[PDB]
Design a protein around this ligand. Structure first.
Ligand code: NA
Ligand code: NA
Ligand code: NA
Ligand code: NA
Lengths: 30, 30, 30
């Protein structure tokens, strides 16, 4: 259970880093 | 405690997809 | 361990809410 949850958390941290970058790009352009 | 963490991770992941789509929709309007 | 996972989930929840705010704002500016 623990290793699967951690791999999911890592996946979340990645998706959120990338979303933050997209948003920061949008904020510059909008 | 453990159950609840796995459920929050599940609802987080089932939210990053909506946010991803919302951001992709915004990328087209700027 | 569960402690670290809870700490990361609280960080991910905060970033989620912040990105949701960022997206609401961007929607008003396009
Ligand atoms: Na991305
Ligand atoms: Na859910
Ligand atoms: Na995008
Ligand atoms: Na802002």
């Amino acid at each position: 259970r623990m290793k699967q949850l951690e791999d999911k958390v890592e996946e979340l941290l990645s998706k959120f880093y990338h979303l933050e970058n997209e948003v920061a790009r949008l904020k510059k352009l909008v």
